[PDB]
Structure formats: C-alpha cells, structure tokens
Write a protein that binds this ligand. Structure first.
Ligand SMILES: [Mg+2]
Lengths: 145, 242, 94, 136, 96, 52, 249
RNA sequence: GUGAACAGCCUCUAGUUGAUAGAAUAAUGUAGAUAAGGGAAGUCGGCAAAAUAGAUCCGUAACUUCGGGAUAAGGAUUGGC
RNA sequence: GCAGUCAAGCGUUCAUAGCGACAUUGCUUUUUGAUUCUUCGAUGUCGGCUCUUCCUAUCAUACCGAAGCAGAAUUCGGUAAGCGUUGGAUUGUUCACCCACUAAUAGGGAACGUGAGCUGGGUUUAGACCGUCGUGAGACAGGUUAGUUUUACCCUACUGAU
C-alpha cells in the first residue's frame, strides 16, 4: 500500500526528526565530479592526415567515424584519446588537470602502442571502417549507374 | 634427471614441450622456469617462450617430435608467426584443424612411432604421418582414452601409468619398439605424461617426485651414459617396497 | 603380481628390418656442464633479469633471440591489416 | 582463488547461482550436479552466491550412482552458457552448463571429459587440462 | 533492537549535498603545488568531449597474466582545439 | 591487509618517489617545455609574413 | 594422531582457567538490566549466563580430551614410552578427573536453568545466577592437581621425536660412553651431543640417512646397565621397549 | 461475416458524438506489458503471474458401490492452392 | 553453601569475651578420556521485510605484550568501534539447533527502534466441530478451522528548487 519504489522506515521515535542520512528523493545528475588517474593513449594533430592509422593498420583514415560522432561534428582539430570514461556527456566542456602528485604504480609508467583504432559508425551497427570499404563490399548499386 | 617446478605446480608436461631439437616454455611471471632449461640444454637447441591461443598451457595444446610441430586451430597468426621466427628450417610448423583442439592429450609419439586417439579423423592421420615423418597407430592404454596424458615416450624407452595390465604392456611395446614400465610420478599421480617431459638425453620432472620414482625414470630412459636399463633389476629393491 | 606390474619391463620383439636409433645433436655432446659456483659461467637470463629490476617488473624482449637473414630488421613491425582482408591471408612465396 | 588454483581468476560474468542443476561432463558415473555453495564467494545481505566458469563449487549428485549420491563433494564448472567476455574482442557462450567432480586438492576423478572445456578454466586447473580432450 | 543483520550503507556521504552545480563548467578546486626550479608549465587545459570508441592494444605489462597479449578496451575522445591567452592574475597570501 | 593510509606503506612509497618514478616526470617536464618553446617560434614566423 | 603429538593447544592452571571463562561471559553477554524491566526479560537474562558459561567450561574441556592421544589403543610402543616416562596411573587419573568435571558443569547448567524459570523478581533471579557461577567455580578449584600435571606432560610429548615402527629402522645399543653418539653424528644429519661422559643423551635420539634410494632412520639409546634385569631407571627403561617393539636391525 | 454459438471481433437499418478543457511528459502511483543466465533459493504459504487450452487420430493407472475414475496421464497433426 | 584447620586484622586499658580476610580441607551418583542417544512443565503478548544512526564489554583486519612458543598453527592480554559480520532447512515464533561458505559469521541500545511504512502469519469479538467440566444456560487464555486494517493538501523536520 502506497508504493514499492521507496524507503519503508524513515526513522524512530527518538530523535523525533528525520535524520540527514536516510536516502530521500530528489535531484540525480548534473553534479561536478573529479575522476583521477586517466591515461592518455594518443595525442593526434588536426593538420595530420591519417590520425586513425597506427603503425600496424597503414590505412589512411581519421578517427572521426562514418557519418561522424553521434550528436557531434568532426574531430578536424587536435584531440586527446584517454582510456575509460570521463564524467560528463558529449558536446560539453571538460578540464584536464595533471596528476596532482607523482604517481607510484607501474601502470603509470607503461608505454602503450595502439594496434587498431575503431572508426566504424556509431549511429547503428558499424561494420565498415571507411566508406571505401563499404562501396567495395556492397558492390555497385542502381544509383551509381 | 632434474627436478623443476613451474610456479608452484609439479606438472611440467602441461607447461612445457620438450623434443630432441627444441623446447617450448610458457611466459608466466618471471624467468625461473626458463632458466632451468638453460641449465641443462645450454645454447645447443632453441628454447622458445610462446603462447598457444593466448594461454599458458602449451604442452597439452601442441604435439611434435624433432621433425615437426603441430599447433591447434585456435593458434593465432602472430603466435604461429612467432614460432617460425625462432625455430630453424629443419622443423616443419603447420596449423592443423580438427574437431578436438588439444593435440598433446591425443598424440603421444617419439621420433619414429606415434599413437593417436581413436576418434581422430583420417584426414589428420595422413597429415601426422606426413609432417612428423612417423607411423601412426590407433590404440588405447588400458582402455583409457587419452594416450598423451597417460603415457610418455622417447626413442630410449616408454613409461605408462600403473593401471596398465601386464598383457597390455607386451602388446603395446611391439608397436612402440621400446621398453615399457608401469610407474607413477610426483607421489602417485596417475597422469604420467603431464607430470614430466623427456627426450633422449634429459628428463625434467616435479619436485614432489620422490627418489624411488627418479630411479625408475633414470633407468627406463637410460640417462647416464653407461646404463643398459638392466640396472632396474639392481634397482628392484626400491621397487618391492615403494 | 601388482608389484610385478612395476617390475616386469616389456620387450619389443624387434618387428622390422628398419633400424631406429636416438638422435643427439652434437652441440649437446660438445656442451660443458653448467656449474653453480664459478667465476666464469654463462649468464642464464634469470641473472639478466636480476640486474635491472626484480621478478614481476622485468620486461622481456621476446624478440632479439631469433633467426633472420639480416639483424637490422629484427625489430620491425608486421602490419597485419590493410583496408580490408588482413595481410596474413595474402603473403606467400611468389 | 584458494588452494589448488594456479594463478588469479579474472572477472567473468556470474552465471550459475545457488540451486542450479548442471550436467556432469566426465565418466565418473553421475548424470547431473546441484550447486549448493560457491567457494571464494562474498558476503552481502540477500545475495545468492553465484558461480562462474572455472570455480570450485560444492555439488550434490541428484541422479547417478547411489555411491556418489547423498554426499557433498567439490565440482569445477567447465561450461557456462551465459555470455561472458574474453579480453580479445568477442563475447562467447557455450550451449549448456557442465561440471566435473573433484577432490579439494583440485584433481580430477574420472578419466575423460566430453565436450569442450572453457579456455578460462583450462588455464586455471592443470589437472582439468590433462584430461581435456577438447579445449574451447 | 540491533538491526539483526549488518549491511553497508547505501550512498556515499562524502558527496553531499546532491544538488545542481552552479555552472556547466566545473571550477578546479586545487592545483599541483609548485616545483620552483622547473621551466614554466601550464597546469591544465580545457576541451570538448566527443563520444567513445574501442582500441585494441598489445599489453606490455610484466607480471600480469595478460603479458604480451592483446587487450580490447574503450577510450574517450575529447576535441581539443588550441587555446589563446588573454589575461594575467596574481594572488596575495593573506591570513584570510 | 594493510590499509591505504598505514605508516608502513607510505614510508615505503616515499622511497620510490625519490627513485625511478620522479625521473620519468622530470624527463617528461623537459620534453614538453621544449615544444612550448617551439610554440612561439612557429607563431612568430606567421607574424613575419604580415611584416612582408 | 600417530607418529607425532604437537596439536594440543594449551592447558591453564585452575586459578587462571576460572578467570578465563568468567571474564569472558562478562564481556560477551549483556550486563545492564533494571528492576523496572518486564520479568521475562529478567529471566532470559540470567538463563543465558548459566547456559553460556556452562558451555564455556565444556568447550575448554572437550578440547583437552580429544587432544590427548588416548594412550589405550595407539601402538604397543607408543603406549609404552608414555608408560615409563609419564606414569600411566597418574596419566589416566587426571584425564579422568576432567571428564568427571565436564559432566558436573553440564549437570549444574541443566539443573539451575530448570530452576531459574520459577523466579519471581530480580532478587531471586540474582541469587540463582550467583549460586550457579559459584558451583561451577567450585568444580574447577577442585581440578587444580590434574591441570598442574598436564601442562608439564604437554611439553615433552610435543618434543618427542618422530619414529614409525612399521618403517625400516636400525637400533644402536651398548654401554654408556662407547661412541654410539659419535657413530650417529657422522652417519646422518643430526644434533646429538658427543660429550665424553656416561649419560649424555636422556631421550631416544633419531637420525635419518639414505641407502639405495630409501629412507632409513637410525635410533640411539642412552646406554643401559643390566644390574638386576628387574628394576631400572626411567631413562634406561626407554631402551628395552625400543629393543622389544621395533622390528629391525 | 468468421465460429459449435444469441461467445468474442468487424459491419448494414436505427441512434449518439454527451462525460470541463489547453499545453508539457519529473518523482510516486492506479491499469496493462516485455526481460539475459538460474528456476520458488522469495515467502506465514507458489500469493501473483507464467504455462496448458479449440479440433481429428492413437492411447489411458491405482482404486471402485461396476455406474464411474477420464478431457486421467501421455503422443503425433492443423495454412494455402 | 555447610562441616571443619588456621589467624593477616578487631574487641573502651586486653588474645583465650565475640567476630574473623586471603587461605585451607572435605560430599552433592562411577580418581583410569568407559560412558551418559535425561532436551523432567517459564501462565503480563511480538516477528520480519525495509532503512538509517550510536555504545565497546573486540569475532575478523591494524600495531603490540607475556607464555610452561623451533617453523607453522594456536592460547592469554593491552591500545583500538576507522571498517566489515552472510547464504539455506523446520516453526506464526523470537529463542533453539544443524548443513555450507567465509578473514569473521562479536554483543547490546534507540517506547524490549521501526502500523496515516507494509504484512495479517500469530494475539483479541460474532459462525462452527472435538475432549474434559456442568442437571442446565454455558465455561476452558485446552486443541482446530473462517474472519472490514480508515485519513496527510496543514505546521515542522528532512531531500530537492526559486
Ligand atoms: Mg657421552
């Protein structure tokens, strides 16, 4: 009776005041957070063509996926690839501080070497890296000839 | 006749492969297990840190002799490329596709005669005889199904697990053309193929393997230079007790 | 008879004309015995590992221990991919 | 991890909770296994201790030999059928759940294992890797 | 009574109050200290986040069980155009 | 096991900062300060074009 | 178990064995009640102090009786070292005095909980608790002379050497100051004193060596004198059953 | 019309378009749903929900007052031209 | 607790009046780990789901001390409540005991926490059957079935928002 998505017992008879720590209902999200120890993999350059090409792939392509990022344009600028998940959403502004102290663990010392960068389209099930792949694999169409 | 322990496991044939002209070792952690092979083998044969399908158990996935090396299907292209870079041209290295992946449990062999699982297909049985340059026989040790886990071979002699009947030993030695003893390794483990590795001039086994058990292994593979294996009658006094 | 299972060795019955002998490469017979306490002995890359870091920290180059016709390309990188259809399917002799 | 398990066990998805009937893969003489508890589990209010691929769980035989039945004994999971994650880029899942029965040392009981054993289990238990006819 | 069954608290009391922040650009609360022999070095930089993508990598991690093996994982890509200086502010230390 | 703020580990971690892991940062703060000096020289060359 | 005896935890003197149990029930069980409380809360308060303390002496005494080797039906030799060294009469009396004391604590606990349910106030329930802990204290004060003995036998039975009578041994016997300590020093890795006087060793020292891929254990005697062949020291009597029972060279 | 049918669903003759409305889609609700792996471990208790269902053919136990039990259980099949 | 052996202390000036601590010695169903499956009757109503806090009399982790402690494994004690303390079976039951994991499954308070938060399982009306008692109406808190769960929009507290 009266709900199931809630807290059942919210207090006791003494003290006769709802405590500051009993999980009430309210705002979720749009807070400011600090998440530390994120590791930069790649510092690309906007004037540099073939950003997405590693030492392995040898395919001239930029990290901008097919039809671009979803809800965002194209990376034709300098970019920082960092692992994990920065708090915040797309088309928002982040601020990148540097480390606040000398980091001790061996994980903060390793030199990475990226072997393949994905650039398939994020607006659906991306199955091709470049549009040259898709027109190669599909064959030709009615609207081409 | 060397005792060696992978990280804290007495199992060696799981974690290493040893033939007459090469050796294969896992990559886990640190180079203590790799050093013990350089203590015995020296620089005379290549010893290879390798992984098979991104694993550490490389002695039960592969199978081979001094002529050839067989890897299963799940061996990636980089790891197949890595084996040929280290090993010389005298070895043949070929990826084999089957139903069953683990070739170590299924193929036990010396440089000359191989034994296979019964359910193996004849389109691989042709390939085994062609790559490894050996004969192939379809047989089971004591009605146990995996001939690679429960038997260990070299050109010198052969060792089987103690459930083998005496009638089964006399039949099976005509196929392998080597002497056969029922034995245990690492204090009574039935799995005698996984416990140890052996070639014609070296045997490497676990630390748990007791001194009566080294006496059997040093005998049947004739590890000292003046051993005709007939000293097992002199070593029968250890055998009656143990 | 169960201890006799661990005593009775088997005999081959010799079942061919074809002779089968063990193979030892002559560098093994030429090889000296390793000695634990000695001013001069080979390094045994445990000790290569020891002088630059301990056990878990030491980075083994898996390369620089294999055979090629030229040492100068021992550290090169396999491309492993072009646009489609990865490179390991195409390369061959001739 | 615990005793007998060589190396560390990475994170894979929790597929088998308490009270899960799974097939008995080996030739020991049992048909199916009933999970009652998972060794190396956590402690949290109202959670069920969930097994995964390659864990030693206590399992009673429901159908099989009467010698094996009515006594609790350890068992190692070899097939999962819940989608888990390999660290190379694929998610895979087997067809059914399966387990082989063992001593607390981590040694096998039977001689053979039918069907494919998981790759995550085959690195973890060497005695399972000795009896594994088919890996992956 | 005495709760009969212990359980950890729900929520983290460090992040109180949960409320909407003052602006869509969060201010930085603290900076790296000062290494006063080094050359002049800007402590931070600000850019625009844009999506996510996957990266495979040959993991060069000694000691792990994934040493010398390939690892797929997810990264973020933050669009980071160059940033131009327009002002200088100095701060005097007070006992306030 | 020992907690994060124990006196034993924080004495142990302070020695590693005296050793290897500060050398990599002091190598890092020299390479980045080199490129920031070449940030002015590229942007002064474009100012020379308008002087023409 | 066989072949060694080290897994016996401890045994405390009776003044301290009482102080362990009673201070434990002051710390574990609650202590704060009022006369204004409802009387079933008062009764179940004092029932638990008799019950938990009653279990408290038993769990101590259950650990003693299981841990001692049960000198009857072990082995004819391992019974017989303890016969000469530990005096089987005084061994079996004191371990029986604990088992009698274990039943009486269960007796007082199962009787006074039955009486404490008929209490009618705080005061009558307070008297039945103090009489219950007092009568449990009386049994333990009576148990002083066993527990003082059993601590001093717990030490040397931990320091007995491991011999297996079924495995292959060989005895070394003779007079005092012959050289049978010096023989044992060079034949194996063992710390046996080689001092030139009569009775250097006072226990059966054991050394282990190998011949033809086997384990041989070599056992030394303190050296013996026949003088009556009837009555003898506790030291020299250790040899004879080490001669009689062990089937070897 | 579909169908065993005055079932349910849609339509013809006839009748009504009345029941305060407009804009947005937070929490919690009332009403109605779907869910990976495990299948009652939930709980006073399988409460609830899921499962089965129409039809032709094969097949049906203990027991029984010989009438029943019985649609027992269980198993094959269904469109179009 | 009683029956004793004492005497460190006391009795207005004092041994032997009169007590009399720590001690000490004895039984209340078996000095030889054999037994001994003895769970010998609580007469006012709480239990659990959810969810916070607090006490330390500390089960686990931290650093220590002593041992009649080789190592390992334990036993006893100190500072210490920062952090954790579970999954199931029978019962309306708390309690109780078993199976199993685990580093450990520590003890208690907050109207014996907690009903405009729930549940209605139990307790506490009317219906009804059985057993005993009563000539009879009926009694029994002996046993067993079936039984209406109402309100927040107000002030304040608290989570959010101008
Ligand atoms: Mg002497």
């Amino acid at each position: 009776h009266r709900g199931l998505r809630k807290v059942a017992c919210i207090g006791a008879w003494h003290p006769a005041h709802v405590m500051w720590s009993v999980a009430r209902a309210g705002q979720r999200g749009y807070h400011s957070r600090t998440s530390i120890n994120h590791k930069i993999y790649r510092v690309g350059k906007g004037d540099d063509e073939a950003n997405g090409a590693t030492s392995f792939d040898r395919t001239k392509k930029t990290i901008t996926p097919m039809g671009g990022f979803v809800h965002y344009g194209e990376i034709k600028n300098d970019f920082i690839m960092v692992k994990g998940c920065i708090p915040g959403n797309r088309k928002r502004i982040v601020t990148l501080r540097k480390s606040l102290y000398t980091n001790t663990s061996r994980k903060a010392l390793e030199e990475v070497s990226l072997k393949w960068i994905d650039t398939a389209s994020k607006f659906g099930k991306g199955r091709f890296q470049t549009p040259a792949e898709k027109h190669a694999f599909m064959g030709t169409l009615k609207k081409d000839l | 006749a060397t005792r060696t322990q992978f990280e804290n496991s007495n199992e060696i044939g799981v974690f290493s492969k040893l033939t007459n002209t090469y050796c294969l070792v896992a990559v886990g952690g640190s180079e203590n297990f790799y050093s013990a092979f350089e203590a015995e083998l020296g620089d005379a044969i290549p010893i290879v840190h390798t992984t098979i399908a991104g694993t550490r158990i490389i002695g039960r996935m592969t199978a081979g002799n001094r002529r050839g090396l067989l890897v299963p299907t799940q061996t990636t292209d980089q790891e197949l490329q890595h084996l040929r870079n280290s090993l010389p041209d005298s070895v043949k290295i070929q990826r084999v596709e089957e139903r069953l992946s683990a070739l170590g449990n299924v193929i036990c062999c010396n440089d000359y005669v191989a034994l296979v699982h019964p359910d193996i297909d004849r389109e691989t049985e042709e390939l085994i005889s062609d790559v490894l340059g050996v004969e192939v026989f379809r047989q089971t040790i004591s009605g146990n199904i995996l001939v690679g886990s429960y038997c260990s071979l070299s050109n010198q002699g052969g060792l089987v697990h103690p459930q083998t009947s005496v009638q089964d030993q006399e039949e099976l030695s005509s196929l392998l053309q080597v002497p056969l003893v029922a034995g245990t390794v690492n204090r009574g483990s039935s799995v005698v193929g996984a416990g140890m590795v052996v070639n014609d001039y070296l045997a490497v086994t676990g630390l748990d393997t007791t001194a009566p058990e080294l006496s059997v292994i040093e005998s049947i593979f004739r590890l000292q230079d003046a051993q005709p294996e007939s000293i097992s009658g002199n070593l029968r006094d250890t055998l009656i007790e143990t | 008879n169960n201890v006799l299972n661990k005593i009775h060795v088997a005999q081959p019955q010799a079942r061919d004309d074809v002779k089968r002998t063990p193979f030892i490469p002559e560098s093994v017979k030429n090889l000296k015995k390793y000695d634990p306490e000695d001013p001069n002995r080979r390094k045994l890359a445990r000790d290569i590992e020891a002088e630059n870091g301990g056990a878990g920290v030491f980075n083994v180059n898996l390369k620089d221990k294999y055979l090629l016709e030229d040492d100068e390309w021992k550290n090169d990188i396999m491309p492993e991919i072009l646009d489609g259809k990865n490179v390991y399917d195409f390369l061959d002799p001739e | 991890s615990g005793n007998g398990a060589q190396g560390t066990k990475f994170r894979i998805s929790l597929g088998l909770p308490v009270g899960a009937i799974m097939n008995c893969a080996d030739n020991s003489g049992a048909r199916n296994l009933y999970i009652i508890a998972v060794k190396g589990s956590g402690s949290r209010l109202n959670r069920l201790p969930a097994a995964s691929l390659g864990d030693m769980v206590m399992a009673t035989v429901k159908k099989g030999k009467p010698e094996l039945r009515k006594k609790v004994m350890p068992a190692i999971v070899v097939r999962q059928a819940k989608s888990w994650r390999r660290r190379d880029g694929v998610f895979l899942y087997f067809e059914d759940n399966a387990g082989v029965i063992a001593n607390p040392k981590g040694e096998m009981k039977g001689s053979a294992i039918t069907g494919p054993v998981g790759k995550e289990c085959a690195d973890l238990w060497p005695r399972v890797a000795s009896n594994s006819g088919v890996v992956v | 009574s005495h709760r009969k069954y212990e359980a950890p608290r729900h929520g983290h009391l460090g992040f109180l109050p949960r409320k909407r922040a003052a602006s869509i650009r969060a201010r930085v609360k603290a900076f790296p200290k000062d290494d006063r022999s080094k050359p002049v070095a800007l402590t931070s930089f600000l850019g625009y986040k844009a999506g996510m993508t996957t990266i495979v990598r040959d993991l060069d991690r000694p000691g792990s069980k994934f040493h010398k093996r390939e690892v797929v994982e997810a990264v973020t890509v933050v669009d980071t155009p160059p940033v131009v200086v327009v002002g200088v502010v100095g701060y005097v230390e007070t006992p306030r | 096991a020992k907690s994060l703020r124990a006196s034993s580990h924080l004495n142990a971690k302070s020695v590693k900062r005296r050793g290897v892991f500060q050398k990599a940062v002091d190598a890092r703060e020299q390479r980045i300060s080199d490129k920031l000096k070449e940030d002015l020289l590229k942007q002064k060359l474009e100012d020379l074009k308008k002087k023409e | 178990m066989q072949l060694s005896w080290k897994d016996i935890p401890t045994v405390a003197p009776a003044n301290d064995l009482l102080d362990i149990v009673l201070n434990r029930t002051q710390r574990k069980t609650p202590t704060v009640i009022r006369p204004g409380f409802k009387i079933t809360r008062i009764r179940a308060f004092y029932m638990r102090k008799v019950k938990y303390t009653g279990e408290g002496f038993v769990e101590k005494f259950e650990d003693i009786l299981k841990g001692f080797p049960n000198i009857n039906d072990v082995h004819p030799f391992h019974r017989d070292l303890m016969d000469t060294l530990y005096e089987k009469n005084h061994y079996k009396i004191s371990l029986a005095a604990i088992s009698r004391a274990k039943s009486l604590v269960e007796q007082v606990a199962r009787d006074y909980v039955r009486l404490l349910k008929f209490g009618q106030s705080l005061f009558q329930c307070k008297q039945l608790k103090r009489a219950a802990l007092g009568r449990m204290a009386t049994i333990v004060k009576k148990l002083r002379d066993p527990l003082a003995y059993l601590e001093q036998v717990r030490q040397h039975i931990g320091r007995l050497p491991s011999i297996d009578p079924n495995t292959r041994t060989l005895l070394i016997c003779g007079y005092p100051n012959v050289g049978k300590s010096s023989f044992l020093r060079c034949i194996t890795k063992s710390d046996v004193d080689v001092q030139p006087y009569a009775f250097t060793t006072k226990s059966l020292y054991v050394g282990h060596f190998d011949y033809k891929y086997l384990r041989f254990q070599a056992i030394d005697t303190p050296g013996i004198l026949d003088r009556p062949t009837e009555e003898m020291n506790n030291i020299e009597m250790q040899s004879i059953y080490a001669i009689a029972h062990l089937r070897s060279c």
